[PDB]
Symmetry: C3
Subunit: 112 residues, 3 copies
């Protein structure tokens, strides 16, 4: 099992989660975050002066899935989250050693 952690534009949550759900990837945790990447933020202008805004709102989605499904999850996220402009997102894959469903104490792949 692996956690796919993707930080994406807030306005892309709806299309990404629909595309994931349609492909069978339903279990997901969503968090509001702020961040920056390589570019260090965005340049804005106020009264003729340019300045850097160095933290931008994003949404973090976390999906724990079987390892064999990671490629497809990443492909779906990238296809649907992309706009072509810097800031479209970053994905990390993090190992998950155990998964437990609280209600039933099921573990493993059936507990996803």
């Amino acid at each position: 099992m692996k956690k796919v952690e993707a930080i994406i534009r807030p306005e892309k949550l709806e299309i990404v989660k629909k595309a994931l759900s349609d492909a069978g990837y339903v279990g997901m945790t969503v968090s509001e975050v702020k961040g920056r990447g390589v570019q260090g933020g965005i340049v804005e202008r106020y009264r003729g002066r340019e300045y850097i805004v160095d933290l931008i709102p994003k949404v973090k989605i976390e999906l724990v899935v079987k390892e064999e499904d990671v490629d497809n999850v990443i492909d779906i996220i990238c296809e649907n989250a992309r706009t072509g402009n810097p800031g479209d997102g970053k994905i990390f894959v993090i190992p998950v050693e155990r998964v437990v469903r609280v209600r039933t104490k099921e573990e493993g792949k059936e507990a996803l």
Copy 2:
């Protein structure tokens, strides 16, 4: 060292954190999140029409602990977070390779 990441009902935070603390599991980070599991959300009715609400508020708790304590932490969370209805929670165990206390630069088990 392992991170126990549990996503549970918001109204179960108090009883879960009390039970963990009573058993000696104190260090914890709490985050407000939204999510869905297998069921894909909840069915609601508005003016006779049923629709799906596909993200539900939850609370994420993260406890970094010694590996030997993971079983007990999971047992405590499940016992106290359960209600018997879908949505009671999901737990992931994620490896933690290093722990550092900022104030003192202590590392390892004593830094938990």
Copy 3:
């Protein structure tokens, strides 16, 4: 690749992120959290009575970096986040097995 996850005082975000950026560590995700450590919270007094506040606001910063840079990232965070009083922060290092830039589908170290 490794995720450095640091939970620090909210009022230290600015100096920590500036120091990290100055040293070349730019990519970062920031989350608002609450937590407690060893001390279990803070003692407060209201109308002569002392009570425990057991969750304190903090900021979580997450930086995914090359393994060889983890030591330096931790050193920078600790130097700039410390005040000398309990609550200055906790850092966890979590393995990251894959990194993908959404816009370009780049992976690996160049996608950081």
